[PDB]
RNA sequence: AAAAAAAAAAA
RNA sequence: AUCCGUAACUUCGGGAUAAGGAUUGGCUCUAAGGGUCGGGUACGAUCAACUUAGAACUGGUACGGACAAGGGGAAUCUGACU
RNA sequence: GAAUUUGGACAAACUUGGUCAUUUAGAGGAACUAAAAGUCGUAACAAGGUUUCCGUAGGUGAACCUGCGGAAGGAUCAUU
RNA sequence: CCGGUUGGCCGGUCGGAUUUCCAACGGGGCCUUUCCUUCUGGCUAACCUUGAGCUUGGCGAACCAGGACUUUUACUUUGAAAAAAUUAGAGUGUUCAAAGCAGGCGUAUUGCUCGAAUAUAUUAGCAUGGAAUAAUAGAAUAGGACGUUUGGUUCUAUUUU
RNA sequence: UAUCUGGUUGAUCCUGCCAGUAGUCAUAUGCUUGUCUCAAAGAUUAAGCCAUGCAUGUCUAAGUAUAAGCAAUUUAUACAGUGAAACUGCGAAUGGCUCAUUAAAUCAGUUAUCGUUUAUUUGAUAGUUCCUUUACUACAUGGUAUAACUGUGGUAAUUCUAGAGCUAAUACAUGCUUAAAAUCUCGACCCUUUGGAAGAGAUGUAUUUAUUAGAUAAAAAAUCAAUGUCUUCGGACUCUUUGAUGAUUCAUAAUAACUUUUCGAAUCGCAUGGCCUUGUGCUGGCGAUGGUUCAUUCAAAUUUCUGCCCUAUCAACUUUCGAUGGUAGGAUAGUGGCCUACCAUGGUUUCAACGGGUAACGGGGAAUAAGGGUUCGAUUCCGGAGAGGGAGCCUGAGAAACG
């Protein structure tokens, strides 16, 4: 987050096929395209107002959430538009008739819509392969 | 591998064909068509193992080559055409008309019918869409594409069809208290007059149904199939009428009528 | 309250 | 000279430029690395240097082009070393 | 429109070294086990004839000796 | 209060079943200070709705639609799903049995007909009821909850003019 | 079918092990062997080598037939029966065999493609293509090869072949023929102000880019910039059209152009019939084949979540030259560090990473069991991988193909 001087890179980052005619003068200083990914998830005013682009965002980016809806807590947010979360769980070993703790560290893509910290509980929704490891995207946060 | 497969072994097909584990290692792989492979009667089996009108696929080839048989009013001179649910067969010789449906055991039954019943059939819509040039069309479970329907028709409805043309004569919508038939699962073969469904936005709309004897169960909208309203169906049913008796009362009935 | 070592194995 | 790779042993400091290999010209380009000034109580203008990395093109596979500039390794006797 | 051709990516295979892993010889050395009516003694089991044992250090042909500290599995459950 | 399963005379049928019954057994609802999420709609539902003993007119879920919202799990019940073959297992003549999924019944002259079940199939994942057990969160430098109210700020906007 | 026994001792009670016992679709072997049924079988060591011979070829009424082949039609003088060879189209990527590799890889169950390709099927589905498109044209329909075969030869030999002479197509290869209307553009000219015009061209589908619609919980008023529907020009105003998904830049449609320009039937059999202004006039059936797009089916590729044996005498691994991520682009059928350029410094790990080993393909399942469990599973089914080891590639829908 932190609004990051949006046009920092070399390419011009914009929403594709969103053409704001300069000939017409209006309010709505720029056209911003967004959506609602269903499942009761609230696309925030921060997304609909902000200037960030994020091709990979589910709200303003040309992707689509489908499949699994998981939950975790954040343990590493050192990357750009990406984080890692720890999905703890138990696992039954029948011989002893009891369990053992386990985990998975899962990398997930985050949008600039959300500001997040380590320890923040979140939920995530599966997307298509974003990268070599990221098959998910952030959809809601549940702490401060 | 390296492409499709075109064989099929015994012990690999469905159990509902009732092919013996003996009699060679193989079984007939259905060719392509409207109906999925895991639910398809095809003709060789329908004739040889159910009806006993033939002993060998050679005899069956002779039959289809002399063009006795048709399906949906079409000859279909292929040994392994996929014959699926609701599927009407007509043998001009013997003036016989069957309609592929299931029994309580999930098995394709031998449901002899009349010609007026052969002259139509039902189709569960699998989608509606806009073809090229603003044309609306639909697609059923039996692969049929159909144009310019009633806009009131939406998904998961059933459509009564002319069977000479591929035109729609009528349709039934999806609502509580509608007569159903099952296509797939542990509860296959039953009929139970829907009580209510549940949405589960994100996948697998479910539905609760209760048979005439108040025996309730739950199934998936992929498996369900609507045929009419409370009481009246739009078609002829076989014996049993989708009740799913228990084995105890079943053997009791056998002992009564032995 | 000097000294006083060893005895094939088997049962 | 740049890059890579570096054994035994060891007083853990070294051995070690270990060993052992690749590259190196010219020309045309690119990139990065700086100073001084300007702002009610994010920048812009100007100035000037040598260093490093990279890409094309080229040549009778040549390029630390002359000069200059270590041969190395395994072991022993011996004296610890300068 | 064939032969042929420039450059590029894929890159088999070979040459040389580098490393890892598995077996394999090796003068000689130092252990272990077994057999043996061998030699030297008799360290241990009784207060085993210096009570045994532990750790440690040194020594000696060999068991083993001795010094310091400890233990009792001691030969003392004990001196109002 | 309601109604289900066992019972129990009765056997009012000829060793099968009823209904009014003493009891137990499990379920649902109501009140006891007990919201046990509601906003907009319609069936208005069961309706003060009463027309003379079956009629003209109560409260939205019991029927859906969409909405604001909506503490998290674990566990457990049920359900689906867990390919067949195999496994246990029902029926059935392989002459028994292993086997197999066939077979049986007639006036056998024309034909009739039962079938080929069922159960388990870890764990993970899906849906559902429960809500004990074990954890988790909440309102304490109250930036806290309700809210008929009272200004206001911002946002969006159909119907019409 | 929840069972124990012998052995340390002079004898005793314990620990504890050795041996014994039972079974094994677990193998080998010795001895023996008369019957019925069913039936595994070069996996273990050498995924080591292989003689020979077989294992994928294929036609109908319905692609091409002067066989200088067979027959006789006798309905036939173009053919018209059968029919080798050869062209063409399909298939040969299925199946079958083995388990060498492979330890989050395979695989199982479970998701997804709003992230993609798909022969064949099945059902639907092109009136728009004459290009100065008023002689430019065959549209009762356009052209060229070339096999097979004739004959000449080469070779020691191969499923080797050349030159020379013909000939066909659903082979190659161009190319026409059908509405009408409506909307746009330009636009002659009449000219007006209210301003209107004749005429020309364009308008299928496919590919590419760009742009637009693809929606909406509720009710009324104030005027205007211009009058818009028609007027009793006061202003009556309605009519207005919008599907799906949980959700899209979805589907679909529309404008502007683009394309070396796709597709839109020069095909075949049987029946041969109706109308007449009786011409080889105009119409006309049942099929096979072929084709764009969509859907379906057969699938395929990637993919979510959870789970795998032994080892710490492997504790730190990855990142030079791709490791984790971001942006853009190339490539892909398509997502994506899959690859490239630039940038940031991240990613995994005592919940055992990384590494090593396996006498390890994984499962479904097998043996043995009171229960719990242990051991096994190359092997009759599913999924993978491989064709002596590696890499590469044409063909095709489909192969990194191995008959």
Swiss-Prot record, chain A:
It comes from the Eukaryota. There is a cross-link at residues 14, 45, 55-56, 78, 95, 104, 132, 140 (Glycyl lysine isopeptide (Lys-Gly) (interchain with G-Cter in ubiquitin)). Its main location: cytoplasm. It is found in: Cytoplasm. InterPro entries: NA-bd_OB-fold, Ribosomal_uS17, Ribosomal_uS17_arc/euk, Ribosomal_uS17_CS, Ribosomal_uS17_N. N-terminally acetylated by acetyltransferase NatA. GO terms for molecular function: rRNA binding; structural constituent of ribosome. Transmembrane segments: none annotated. Keywords: Acetylation, Cytoplasm, Isopeptide bond, Ribonucleoprotein, Ribosomal protein, RNA-binding, rRNA-binding, Ubl conjugation. GO terms for cellular component: 90S preribosome; cytosol; cytosolic small ribosomal subunit. The keyword Acetylation applies. Belongs to the universal ribosomal protein uS17 family. Component of the ribosome, a large ribonucleoprotein complex responsible for the synthesis of proteins in the cell. The small ribosomal subunit (SSU) binds messenger RNAs (mRNAs) and translates the encoded message by selecting cognate aminoacyl-transfer RNA (tRNA) molecules. The large subunit (LSU) contains the ribosomal catalytic site termed the peptidyl transferase center (PTC), which catalyzes the formation of peptide bonds, thereby polymerizing the amino acids delivered by tRNAs into a polypeptide chain. This is Small ribosomal subunit protein uS17A. It comes from Saccharomyces cerevisiae (strain ATCC 204508 / S288c) (Baker's yeast). The gene is RPS11A.
Swiss-Prot record, chain B:
The modification Phosphothreonine is found at residue 114. Residues 41-104 form the S4 RNA-binding domain. Keywords: Cytoplasm, Isopeptide bond, Phosphoprotein, Ribonucleoprotein, Ribosomal protein, RNA-binding, rRNA-binding, Ubl conjugation. GO terms for biological process: cytoplasmic translation; translation. GO terms for molecular function: RNA binding; rRNA binding; structural constituent of ribosome. InterPro entries: KOW, Rib_uL2_dom2, Ribosomal_eS4, Ribosomal_eS4_C, Ribosomal_eS4_central_region, Ribosomal_eS4_central_sf, Ribosomal_eS4_KOW, Ribosomal_eS4_N. PROSITE patterns: RIBOSOMAL_S4E, S4. Component of the ribosome, a large ribonucleoprotein complex responsible for the synthesis of proteins in the cell. The small ribosomal subunit (SSU) binds messenger RNAs (mRNAs) and translates the encoded message by selecting cognate aminoacyl-transfer RNA (tRNA) molecules. The large subunit (LSU) contains the ribosomal catalytic site termed the peptidyl transferase center (PTC), which catalyzes the formation of peptide bonds, thereby polymerizing the amino acids delivered by tRNAs into a polypeptide chain. HAMAP family: Ribosomal_eS4. Belongs to the eukaryotic ribosomal protein eS4 family. Present with 573 molecules/cell in log phase SD medium. This is Small ribosomal subunit protein eS4A. The gene is RPS4A.
